[PDB]
Amino acid sequence: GYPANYAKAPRFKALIYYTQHAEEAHVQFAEQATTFFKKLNYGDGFVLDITTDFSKYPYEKLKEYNVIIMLNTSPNTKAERDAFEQYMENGGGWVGFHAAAYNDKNTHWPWFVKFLGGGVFYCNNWPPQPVLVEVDNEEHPVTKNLPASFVAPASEWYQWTPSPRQNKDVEVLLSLSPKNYPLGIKDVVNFGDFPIVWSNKNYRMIYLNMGHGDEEFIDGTQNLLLVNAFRWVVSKDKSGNPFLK
Amino acid sequence: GYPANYAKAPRFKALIYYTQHAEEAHVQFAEQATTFFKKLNYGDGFVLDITTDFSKYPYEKLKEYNVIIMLNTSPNTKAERDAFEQYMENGGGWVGFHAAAYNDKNTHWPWFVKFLGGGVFYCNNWPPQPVLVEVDNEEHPVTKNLPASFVAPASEWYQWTPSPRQNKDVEVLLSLSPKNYPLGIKDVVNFGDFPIVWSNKNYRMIYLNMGHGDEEFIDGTQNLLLVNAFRWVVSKDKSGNPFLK
Amino acid sequence: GYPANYAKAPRFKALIYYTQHAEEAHVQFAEQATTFFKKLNYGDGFVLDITTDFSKYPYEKLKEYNVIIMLNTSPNTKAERDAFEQYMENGGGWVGFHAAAYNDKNTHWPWFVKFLGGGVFYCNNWPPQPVLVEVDNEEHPVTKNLPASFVAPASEWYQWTPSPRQNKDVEVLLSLSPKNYPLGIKDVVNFGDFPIVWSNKNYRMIYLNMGHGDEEFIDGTQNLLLVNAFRWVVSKDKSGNPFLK
Numbered sequence A, B, C: 001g002y003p004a005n006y007a008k009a010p011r012f013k014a015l016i017y018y019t020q021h022a023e024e025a026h027v028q029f030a031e032q033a034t035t036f037f038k039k040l041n042y043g044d045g046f047v048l049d050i051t052t053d054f055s056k057y058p059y060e061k062l063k064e065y066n067v068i069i070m071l072n073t074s075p076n077t078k079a080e081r082d083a084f085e086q087y088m089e090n091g092g093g094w095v096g097f098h099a100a101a102y103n104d105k106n107t108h109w110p111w112f113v114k115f116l117g118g119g120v121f122y123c124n125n126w127p128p129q130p131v132l133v134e135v136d137n138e139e140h141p142v143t144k145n146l147p148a149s150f151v152a153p154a155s156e157w158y159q160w161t162p163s164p165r166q167n168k169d170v171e172v173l174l175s176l177s178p179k180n181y182p183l184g185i186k187d188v189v190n191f192g193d194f195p196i197v198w199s200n201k202n203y204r205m206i207y208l209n210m211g212h213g214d215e216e217f218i219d220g221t222q223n224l225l226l227v228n229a230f231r232w233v234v235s236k237d238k239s240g241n242p243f244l245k
Helices: A024-040 A078-089 A110-116 A220-235 B024-040 B078-089 B110-116 B220-235 C024-040 C078-089 C110-116 C220-235
Strands: A013-017 A047-051 A067-070 A093-097 A120-124 A129-135 A149-155 A158-161 A170-176 A195-200 A204-208 B013-017 B047-051 B067-070 B093-097 B120-124 B129-135 B149-155 B158-161 B170-176 B195-200 B204-208 C013-017 C047-051 C067-070 C093-097 C120-124 C129-135 C149-155 C158-161 C170-176 C195-200 C204-208
Touching (some): A024 A047, A078 A110, A129 C220, A149 A220, A220 B129, A220 B149, B067 B220, B204 B220, B220 C149, C013 C024, C024 C047, C024 C220, C093 C220, C149 C220
Parallel strands (some): A013 A047, A013 A067, A067 A093, C013 C067, C093 C204
Antiparallel strands (some): A129 A149, A129 A170, B120 B158, B195 B204, C129 C170, C170 C195, C195 C204
């Protein structure tokens, strides 16, 4: 048999959402990550919509998207938050990066904290720097063609309380190695669990902690992780896997 | 004695040939790869000539080059084809990239199909993406200082039929790992042998499947493979190894 | 308790010194390496001063710095050499790159030759190219989160005589692998010991042989080595580790 499946029309719809109302380093990442996903849509393998205004997307308009890619922020208004809740509870897809999972005592969105796996922002290192990362599960579609360990390019890295690993429904896929400790020049992280890529198995979602600055696409290994993360979430659609059409 | 051999004059002549009559991503690679080889000639270690018109090179003018670097296409006219045939049959050198080996039912160049090792274009993945690659032979001068496996930067990757590995006179040096399967977002490759760097031992030649887009030089490991590929073909010259002068 | 130490004010002072009176490739590295250290000082984790004139820094003014980063040259006048000698003998810190350690029969500075570990310039490869490098000691703070081996991005590489490894007081941390031999297109290095990152344990210092051209920051792994090198020299300040404040 022939080994290749050539698409006859776009396979699925993806929505990119990012804000300009964020730290310059987060806007820079969001703009370069948009270019990265646009390049993946050269030849129209899928339908890619880009927005800076999530208020135009109630649940009824979010339904058509296989996946939402949130590059630097999460919904802030009740209307936006409710739309995303209903979308995720009804089998929607999510690829979240860095500050898209940021939450503290002033977020007042317990559904989101639960959706992420319980982790509230705890600490971070400073300045952004490369780190040694480790694959927690080598048999997963996100990591099956990734080296067991590699140096990720420079980012600001976050710890959470409790660690998402403490959640029975969370599957941690990549972690920041404790061999990096003490980590930081300005703000130093000295210990603790440091997961950076995970999935809450109750939802069709993946979170990646990297997403800061203008140099997150200089590394082939991390770019492969991003392709793998996006592809896995898209393939898991309850209405069917789009790569089999 | 002293461990270094300093050149007294340029060691050999190389010719770069690429076309502007190709997909923009093929011209982008060709332009960046030309810069890469120009940087290797800082200080004039060799003589590097660059052309976009192979019709100016009959066999008598190709004789003067140790190696021809074909970045994105192969000869298309009988005169150009015949010149390249005579050059390769008389001990000439070749470094071919990506679309320089492309051939199908409308090519009508059976010598070139044989020269490449028999492989006719079969399929490809889409869009371009990084992949896990594996060294087939770790003792070879092209791969002796390369990691056993690594993630190559983004490219469009080709399968051939029959696989060049099936030819007794071909030595496969690098392979796209089956751990990458299923490979593709638009056009998905699900199985089969996937050699990407090989040599037909009947000629002083090397083929590298990568060569697409404007980010093929972001990776030190793949840049080393390219230095190694070029150096190996040049060293094997029948009139003597230029690196020993 | 809490795993993170957030700085309340800049932790230490660093001085960058580079010359414009050097090969362009050495000036290009120096300018990009200055940007790299400026990015490490985003948010003012430390105080970073930059100069092209070391004659403005007698010992009395050098004492205020935890570390001196020498990107492409060493002190050339007796006044500049005496200032640097007194600074290093009184517990000063040093991070040196590439041509900053260059010395030959016309240097007439035996203190510096001793400070470096005894190595006099012997030979080099040409043109600059990536190479397979190996970690010599995996337990050291400079290498504890680095892969055991990796391909470093393109640089011109130096051999010394005698090897710094022959010195009982020197700790070699990274080496250029002999698997790279024969190394070079123009100027070929065929054998010998090839250390590239080391420390003379009699001083608070680290030397890194890389530092040539405009593409030394394309690799996450080598960027981590540079962060690690800088952090380790700074952390060993006799007046106390600045990262524990």
